[PDB]
Assembly symmetry: D2
Homo-oligomer: 264 residues x 4
């Protein structure tokens, strides 16, 4: 009776289905897969990438960047929602090939440093190549790249270092407030009485309130299904998209019902 073999992190086939760069705003593009958000912001002084998806999406991200006229050396900064394998995967490879920097808070940095290992809920289940953060950011700190200001918003819950990013773009001159809120889900988490996360419920409840008060005209999420986005249809992607109020309120109803069954 030998010890069990290692098990790879296998996901849905749609999480790895490549797609052409979809336009969200004048300067905002979606260059990830169909069911994994990877946003690219093009400025006059460089490019910014928000999340990267699965670790094997590094070649796909660089393919779409060159379709947008972005060279590897043009990627100046990498921002992350939370440091999980399905969002912060190719960060280690994109730093080696793009000369880019990574900005994240302390909790996302310590999780990114150990490649998602020793997860508070998953343990060593979703390990990815480790990367290092080059700039530590705080709650409400503004990050400016090429005239575009990215404001951070701490929304801890899914991970201790979950961060929502808000920035203002344009749609043919008309300004648009874009808010990239992180996942408000707890799949299989022990909510009440967790010794690894003693204040998990408090942070989740406080995150529901933070997501509602986000300056937002167009909401996106790391998983497009969480915000009723459909990257596949293309032009009608943001048709049935939800609001910040609708997103936080729907995520809170699932949270309380899950917390209610946990006590049972």
């Amino acid at each position: 009776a030998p010890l069990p073999q290692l098990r790879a992190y296998t996901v849905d086939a749609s999480w790895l289905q490549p797609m052409a760069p979809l336009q969200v705003a004048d300067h905002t593009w979606q260059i990830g897969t169909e069911d994994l958000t990877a946003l690219l912001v093009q400025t006059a002084e460089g490019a910014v990438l928000l999340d990267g998806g699965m670790p094997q999406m590094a070649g796909h991200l660089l393919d779409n960047m060159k379709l947008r006229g972005v060279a590897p050396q043009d990627l100046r900064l990498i921002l992350l929602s939370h440091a999980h394998a399905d969002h912060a995967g190719p960060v280690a490879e994109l730093k080696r090939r793009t000369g880019a920097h990574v900005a994240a808070n302390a909790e996302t940095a310590v999780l990114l440093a150990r490649g998602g290992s020793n997860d508070l809920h998953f343990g060593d289940g979703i390990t990815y190549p480790p990367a290092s953060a080059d700039r530590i950011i705080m709650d409400g700190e503004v990050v400016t790249v090429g005239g575009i200001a990215f404001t951070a918003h701490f929304m801890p819950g899914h991970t201790p270092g979950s961060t929502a990013w808000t920035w203002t773009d344009t749609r043919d001159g008309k300004p648009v407030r874009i808010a990239y809120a992180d996942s408000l889900s707890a799949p299989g988490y022990q909510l009440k009485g967790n010794p690894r996360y003693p204040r998990l419920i408090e942070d989740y409840k406080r995150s529901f309130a933070t997501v509602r008060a986000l300056p937002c005209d167009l909401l996106l999420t790391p998983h497009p299904g969480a915000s009723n986005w459909n990257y596949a249809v293309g032009s009608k992607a943001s048709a049935e998209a939800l609001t910040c109020n609708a997103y936080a309120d729907a995520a809170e109803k699932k949270f309380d019902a899950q917390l209610a069954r946990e006590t049972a």
Copy 2:
């Protein structure tokens, strides 16, 4: 046509076959699996562990330590051959559970820090939970734990931070010189003209000469088959074991023949 899924590091069933602590010397024990060496040295001032095997062997290593009367808090130091997944796997977990420290050279430390990712030959193929080295050691530096002195010997080749450890034990009072030499194999390595390892042949040839001149009465290797060890038979394990001269000479003949076919 989606992107390919992640692939787990699967090994032979014998690499994960647990075994009872096998006695090598008065203070030296083998607490790993049948085809993966994990040595335990028991002293009056603590315990020393040399290598740990596959990442899923952490529970097995702690099981055999308690069979030897070693508590988790008694493990003072962890030494490594080279920082690969099949030898330096459970190091991250054993540091969390044993309060132990890790001593390695700079090359093994930088490889252990990124969990084997960006391997010079394997890339991101054999990623394991990342660990940190607490003490940087140099070539020939002596590490003393409880009156037992561990002398390091740099033998670069398999990895840039490959290290052979030599220490003197006893066999009912009679002293025994034990040498734990690292792997001298290059499975699938590009030997000549490697841009990631330009001086690979020089380090390999210089390592063959370093292994021969090791003070050794009983030679062990991270893979027992490389030194003609058979942990399964038990008492007759060290019967057909090879010498340092035989180990280095046999490994050099395979190296030159492999290098000869590479040019073809």
Copy 3:
């Protein structure tokens, strides 16, 4: 006109005045200097150190530990208030000499990793030898060492990773609730409108409320003068000591008055 020379972090002569181990409880001792708190907790399964003082206090801390019958290998864990040079100094040296581990939250870990450099308020003014945290702890997480449970309490303000530690000891059988609250001061900090710490006032106000509700029968602080402690008199040290309510209320009055003059 050459560039200015480097300037060392010079403190008061009383911060570096050694003293004999002062007894606080049955298992709690003060082994630092006269005006720098360094607490030692002796258990049946090891010793715990809370803070270490100035970087040059490493030899003094080890001197008092041996006076308490504590060997270097007996120090199992190191806990910190905040990762500044006058409190987390000798941590890098004590890890090399004691085989101990360091537990801290993510913010204290990222600050300890860069040796206090790039401080949000001091910059590169108070750089100390960098150390690494071996275990990341969360708000309210319990850390047990030898039957004594240390509960963490996040009180951000002085540093983003400021932590108050609470544990229950005895005084000849009678239990005593000890609370080691961090500094609630902001010397020279820009409170309102700080781009490096946008939510500084909110964290300070929320920390005043967290310090009041701490389970405490005897309050200590990293600076004994902040809690009206006098390590010099010895037996009458805790005579005029303040309560958690008195400490938080007095620190809040200085904070609001400082904030009021900042707007002027």
Copy 4:
């Protein structure tokens, strides 16, 4: 009798005397101080910086880069001789302000990670703000930036991670082989029988032989006085400059004489 205060790393006034960018080749410039070499290489695809000097030279380096038409975002890579305070000082600050990457071997990376603390010879005497290396390089590995190839040459001795960099430039079309060899000095080092560096003499002797065989038409050193450079005179700076043979032979004569007096 209090403990001694911290002591800052004070150097000569000439090590911090700023100077205008001095031209060494068509693409190579000296932008450091009078007695501290800091080389800037300008390419069509970015800029490369070799060494940075004292930690307080970060503002001076950025001043000269803008005089050369180099923006902070144009600095793509930072290369180092060895990770000491007088050469790898402002690396931590230049990474925050230039978006640049650092490439170094494993030994220079582990020394740069702890800010020069726990030096094998100086201990915690010359601590500087810690930085992280983004790319690990090996002996003889080529680093290409904008058509200019930088070849590394390991010359261990002064530090375990001492590296000489060689690249070919032009002087009005005519090619020039530039070799930037590291310091071959051991000021106050214990050469024979050092437990922290057991193989120090072997590495020094092997480094003397490596410096002689360097492809070099114009030799520079981190200290211009070591290679008979005089950055002050300007045009006649490289007049009395030494060869690689002269540099290694003169450094070896001082080494053997120092080793001879050590035994006395």
